[PDB]
Symmetry: D2
Subunit: 216 residues, 4 copies
C-alpha cells in the first residue's frame, strides 16, 4: 503493498490560539520506511500569526517512523483505511493546545484534516512573544490501553536567552480498521524548521523518527 | 448599560474527539441577581455522542450577584464586552478547551463560543453518558498579568454513584481597561432543567453569587 | 457525650523540606462545634527554618469545622476512636509537599502525629525566599470515593507584590472505626498566622471553619 | 579522579507509605563507566510492605550511567564531595511518592541517605493491591534550569494482567561542589527486580543506564 518508499502529504489545518482563528495548508513528501518527511507550509488565514510557530510543528503522521521488525507497526498497518489521532499539549505555564488529525490516503498521498485549539496562553509568555527556538530531540512512550495505541511524551522547546519550555504530550491513536496492537515501545523524534520567512508565512518543516526497544 | 433583564443569544461550534457539532441558544437572565436560563438546539453533528454536561458550563460571569464589597470585573467591561478562554481538565485525561468572545447589542449578550475535547476515553462517563449533574461550585478569582482568572475544582455526579472531577482554569480578558478586583469567590449552581431524549433540546439554568469567603 | 465543646490540641510534626530535616511541637485550644481553633507552635529541630512557614500551617483537624444538622459530620462521629488523614499539596512551581496526620484522643485532648515532606522547591521561589504573606480563605470540596472521604481545594498564598501562588490540595480522610459517609458538601476555611516571632520559632495559628452544601 | 571502575554501595532508607512507617537498608556494587549496578536490600522496619515494592526501586545514583564524552558528566564531576537529588513521583491515580537522597563518597563506596513518603494510594489500586510487575524501559530527559540540573521522564509500570500504570517523575539534581553544567541530553534506563522473597524482605535490584544526545 500500500505504502511506497516515497509518499507525499497534503494537509489543511484550521485552528485558533487564545481565540485567534487561523488556517494553514501544507504540501510535502516523506519516505515513511526511514522515518523522514519534509513539508512546506503556507498560512492562509489569520496571518501574521501572533504566536510561536513551534507550538504547531508537531501537529503537522507516525508512519514516518523507522520501525524495526521487532516492533509491530500500528500505523503502516492502518492503511489504506488510515487512522485518526487526538492530542493534548500541556505547557508548564498552563498554555494548552488540543488538536485532532484525521488522516486518509489518496494514491500515494496522505491527507490530513487537522483541528487545533490553544487556550490560556499568557500574554507575556514565551509563546505569545515568540521566544522559542527549537524542539529538542524527543522520545515518545507508546503503550496500549483499552484497545487503542497511546503516546506520552514530556519534552521542551529551547528558549531564546537560555533554558527550556516544557510540554506534556498525551496522544491517543485510533485506527479505522481492526489492527494488531503492539508492545510498550518508544519513538525517538527530531523535528526541525529548516527554513522560514520573517512572519512564518512560509515554513520548511522536517521530521525524523525511529522506533526502538529501549536499552538493549 | 446593563438592564435588570438582559437577553442572550449564542452559537457554539466545536468537536469532541474529532467529531464535529454545532449548537445555538437563546435566553435571558438577571445579571444583578446572578440568574440566567436558556434554550439550546443542536444544529450539526447530532445526536451528540457525549454527555451534555461537559459543554453546559461553557454556555457569562456577568450573571453573578455581586456585592459592593467586591469589584465587578464583568459588568465593568460593558458595553465593550470581554473574552474568556478555559481548560476543563477531567481526571481521566479528557481535556476540553473553550473560548468565548462576548459582545453586547442593546439588551442581548451575544456569544461566539469554541469548544474542543480530546483524549476522552470510549469507556468513560462522558462517552457512555454516565453524567447526572454538576455539583454546586465555588470559583477562586485572582488577578494575574493584568487580567482576571478563575480556578475551580468540581465534579459530576455519576449515574451509579460517585463523582467525576474536572479542573477549571479560566482566563477572563476585558476589552477596555477596567478596575481589577481582589481575591474573591463566586458560588455556582448549574442545572439542566429540561431536555429531550437525545439532548437535541436543552433548557439551562444557572444561579451565581459572589462572596469574600468565610467572614 | 463524646467530644466536649472545649477540647485541647497537642501535637508533634516531624518532616523535611528539600531534604533538610526539622521538627515542630505545638499545643492549642478550640471548640469543634463552633469550628474555631487556635494553637501555639514551637520549632524544636532544624531551626531557624529556611523555608516559608505558611506551607505547614495547613497541616496543623477537620474536627474543627461547624457542621449543620442536615450534613453528616464524618469527623466528630469517628471519635473516640479517631481518624487519620493523608494529603498532597502541589505548588504551581513544581514544589510538592506530602503530609500525613494520625489523630487520636486522650480524654479531652487530640494528639497529632504528623509527618511532612516537601520536595523540589526552587531556590528563587516564594517558599525558599519566604515571600509568602498568607493563605487566602478557601472552600474545600468533599465527596466520597471508594469508601473513604476526600477533599480537594485549590487555594493560593498571598505574595509580596499582591501576586498569588496557587496550590492544589488533595486530602484523603480515613476513620478508624466504621462511620456513616456524607454527601457532596463544602467546608469553608480561613487560616492565618495571628502572631509570630522573627524566624518563626514561635507561631500563633488560628482557623475558623464551617461546612455548607453550596448554592441552594 | 578517586572514583574507580568498580565501586560499592551502602544505603539506608527511612520512609512511610500512606502513613505506615518502614525502613530498609541495602548493599551493592556497580561500574559507573558502564552504567550497571546491583544491590541487595533488606527491610528492617515496617513489617512486610503492604505496598508494591516497585515504587521504591527507583529511589535506590545517576553516576551509574554510561556517558559519551561529548556530554558533560555532571555526576562524576561532583565527587568526592558528592551530590544531592530530590524527586516527586506522580502516579496517574493520584498517589504521589516524594523522595530525597543525600549521596556521599567514602573511599570506594557510595553512601546514600534516603527518605521516602508516598500518600493517597487507594486500596483498590495497583500499588496497594500489589499488582505491579516491573518498570518498563524509560528515557530520561535532563536539562539545566536556574543553575541546577533537572530530570524529567514520565514512564509506566507494567501491570499484572498486561495493563500499564504511568508515573510522572520530576527530579532535581544538585551537586555539592560547583561543577560544569551540561546541555539538554538523555539517559536510557532499564531497572529490574531480579530475585526476592515472598514478601520482598530481600530484593536484588539492577539498573543499566546509558546517556545520549537523542536522535541525530
Amino acid at each position: 503493498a500500500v505504502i511506497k518508499p516515497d509518499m507525499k502529504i497534503k494537509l489543511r489545518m484550521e485552528g485558533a490560539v487564545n481565540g485567534h482563528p487561523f488556517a494553514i495548508e501544507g504540501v510535502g513528501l516523506g519516505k515513511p520506511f526511514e522515518g523522514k518527511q519534509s513539508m512546506d507550509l503556507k498560512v492562509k488565514e489569520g496571518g501574521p500569526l501572533p504566536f510561536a510557530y513551534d507550538i504547531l510543528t508537531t501537529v503537522f503522521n507516525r508512519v514516518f517512523a523507522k520501525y524495526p521488525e521487532n516492533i509491530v507497526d500500528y500505523f503502516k498497518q492502518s492503511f489504506p483505511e488510515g487512522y485518526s489521532w487526538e492530542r493534548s499539549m500541556n505547557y508548564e505555564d498552563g498554555g494548552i493546545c488540543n488538536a485532532t488529525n484525521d488522516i486518509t490516503l489518496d494514491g500515494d498521498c496522505y491527507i490530513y484534516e487537522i483541528r487545533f485549539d490553544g487556550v490560556n496562553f499568557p500574554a507575556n509568555g514565551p509563546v505569545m512573544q515568540k521566544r522559542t527556538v527549537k524542539w529538542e530531540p524527543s522520545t515518545e512512550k507508546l503503550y496500549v490501553r483499552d484497545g487503542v495505541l497511546k503516546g506520552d511524551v514530556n519534552t521542551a522547546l529551547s528558549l531564546e536567552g537560555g533554558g527550556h519550555y516544557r510540554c506534556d504530550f498525551k496522544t491517543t491513536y485510533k485506527a479505522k480498521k481492526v489492527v494488531q496492537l503492539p508492545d510498550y515501545h518508544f519513538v525517538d523524534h527530531h523535528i526541525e524548521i529548516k527554513s522560514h520567512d520573517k512572519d512564518y508565512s512560509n515554513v520548511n518543516l522536517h521530521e525524523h523518527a525511529e522506533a526502538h526497544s529501549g536499552l538493549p
